């Protein structure tokens, strides 16, 4: 047996009124398949939604422990194993996911094999083991048949563009996803639907469409019970408030911290968001990570030093940043910091150049502001605001 089955049996023995409770929770709307799952191995609910919802209702503190057990005992050829592959990737449960992947690419079910190879390309691109070009070639050679993998083969590229600061391709690509074509696996349709809400929120943020950004993150929050998506929804809402509402930005990031207590990665992300927030508002900054050599954290060290005219320390940090490789969006922030430290308009022009290249219409407001404060000609600023980079 699996841990989850054992626990449900035990708990049912102590309290029968649970099954009705589970019945409504699992979307089973008929305790029948509940009985069948408990009593007979290999029984799976029609939708992975059912066991997920029960685990979250009855054993929320044990979700990972139980699901790693359940998922890694499923028949890899099944719809449950495919749904579990998406459950694992959505939650960033890379253990469940990678083992399910190496099992599915070997197996003899074509649907599971296809899911496995596509998610494999996603994980390899995410870990920078392959380039985007090689990912695209591999996806093409797979001759994808299922609508789910047609959608996810686009989603994985969107994740890559977002994480590499290459925002210009995203809007057109995300419009090409058609989730309504997914009819067999409602768990994957609904989870992918949340994925699209969160990605859309990020695209709107990068277009400086702030109200739409928050609308899509609200939709994401309503649509899911997956922590990962809740985290990035609060992150993006808070980011959208960075230049306007300090208290509400802070409140969204603090909400993120409160749901991140047991996840170090998500906690660090919200500390970074608060760090950036407090630098934008030139406040004393209690969130800086002084034990990091990532560009993200070092940049915020330099930003804070610049804000308080500790120019020697700022220069030492920018020296460190000089000896690290930057993407276009990261480089745009670098030139912004250099421009503020040196009071050098040419740095703000370079910052603007790289914000245009990454197609970041949100953070470009920082160098534009600085140029305006230094007395830049008005028509010129209007040109720098409105012209765009040819991609």
């Amino acid at each position: 047996m699996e841990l989850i089955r054992i626990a449900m049996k035990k708990d049912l023995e102590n309290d029968n009124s649970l099954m009705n409770k589970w019945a409504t929770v699992a979307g089973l709307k008929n305790p029948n398949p509940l009985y069948d799952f408990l009593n007979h191995d290999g029984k799976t609910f029609n939708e992975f939604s059912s066991i997920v919802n029960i685990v979250k209702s009855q054993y929320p503190d044990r979700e990972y422990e139980l699901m790693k057990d359940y998922c890694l005992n499923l028949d890899v050829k099944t719809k449950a194993a495919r749904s579990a592959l998406e459950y694992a990737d959505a939650n960033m449960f890379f253990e469940i996911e990678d083992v399910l992947i190496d099992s599915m690419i070997s197996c003899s079910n074509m649907k599971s094999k296809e899911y496995g190879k596509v998610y494999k390309i996603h994980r390899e691109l995410s870990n920078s083991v392959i380039t985007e070009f090689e990912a695209v070639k591999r996806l093409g050679k797979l001759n994808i048949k299922t609508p789910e993998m047609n959608s996810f083969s686009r989603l994985l590229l969107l994740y890559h563009y977002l994480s590499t600061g290459n925002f210009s391709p995203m809007a057109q690509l995300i419009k090409q996803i058609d989730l309504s074509e997914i009819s067999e696996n409602m768990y994957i349709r609904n989870t992918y639907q949340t994925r699209v809400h969160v990605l859309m929120s990020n695209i709107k943020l990068n277009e400086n469409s702030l109200e739409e950004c928050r609308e899509y993150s609200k939709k994401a929050l309503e649509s899911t019970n997956i922590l990962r998506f809740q985290v990035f929804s609060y992150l993006t809402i808070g980011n959208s408030l960075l230049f306007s509402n300090y208290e509400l930005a802070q409140e969204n990031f603090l909400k993120g911290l409160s749901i991140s207590v047991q996840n170090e990665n998500y906690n660090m992300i919200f500390q970074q968001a608060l760090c950036f927030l407090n630098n934008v508002w030139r406040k004393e900054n209690k969130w800086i990570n002084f034990e990091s050599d990532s560009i993200m954290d070092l940049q915020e060290q330099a930003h804070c030093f610049i804000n308080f005219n500790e120019n020697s320390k700022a220069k030492e940090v920018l020296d460190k940043l000089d000896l690290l490789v930057h993407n276009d969006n990261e480089l745009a922030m670098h030139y912004y910091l250099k421009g503020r430290l040196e009071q050098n308009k040419a740095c703000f022009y370079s910052s603007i150049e790289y914000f245009k290249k990454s197609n970041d219409k949100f953070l470009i407001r920082l160098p534009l502001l600085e140029l305006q404060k230094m007395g830049e000609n008005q028509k010129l600023l209007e040109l720098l605001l409105l012209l765009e980079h040819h991609h």
Binding site: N202, V231, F232, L235, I269, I295, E330, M333, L363
Partner: peptide
């Protein structure tokens, strides 16, 4: 920088 994610 500003953290981003989805």
């Amino acid at each position: 920088g500003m953290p981003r994610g989805a």
